[PDB]
């Protein structure tokens, strides 16, 4: 029972870590693009130009 619970927790944590990694990659991309420069990608960094 405890092994099943721990495996479920670890799998859910891995899924959440993948989601957080995707969000952090997006945040790093936003930093690099619209912080260390101006991003021409419209509606990417804030609504409007």
What does the angle CA 48 – CA 38 – CA 40 come to, to the nearest 5 degrees?
55
Binding mask 9-38 for a copy of itself (x = CB under 8 A): xxxxxxxxxxxxxxxxxxxxxxxxx-xxxx
Name the minimum Å distance from CB 13 to a copy of itself: 6
Q: How far is the CB of 45 from a copy of itself (least distance, A)?
A: 8
State the burial class of residue 29 (Cβ atoms within 10 Å of its Cβ: 0-12, 13-18, 19+): middle
- Count of residues near a copy of itself by CB under 8 A: 48
Summarize as ranges the residues that interact with a copy of itself (CB under 8 A). Answer: 1-33, 35-49
């Amino acid at each position: 029972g405890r092994l099943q619970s721990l495996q479920t927790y670890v799998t859910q944590q891995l899924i959440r870590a993948a989601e957080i990694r995707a969000s952090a990659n997006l945040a790093a991309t936003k930093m690099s693009e619209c912080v260390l420069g101006q991003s021409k990608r419209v509606d990417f960094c804030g609504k409007g130009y």
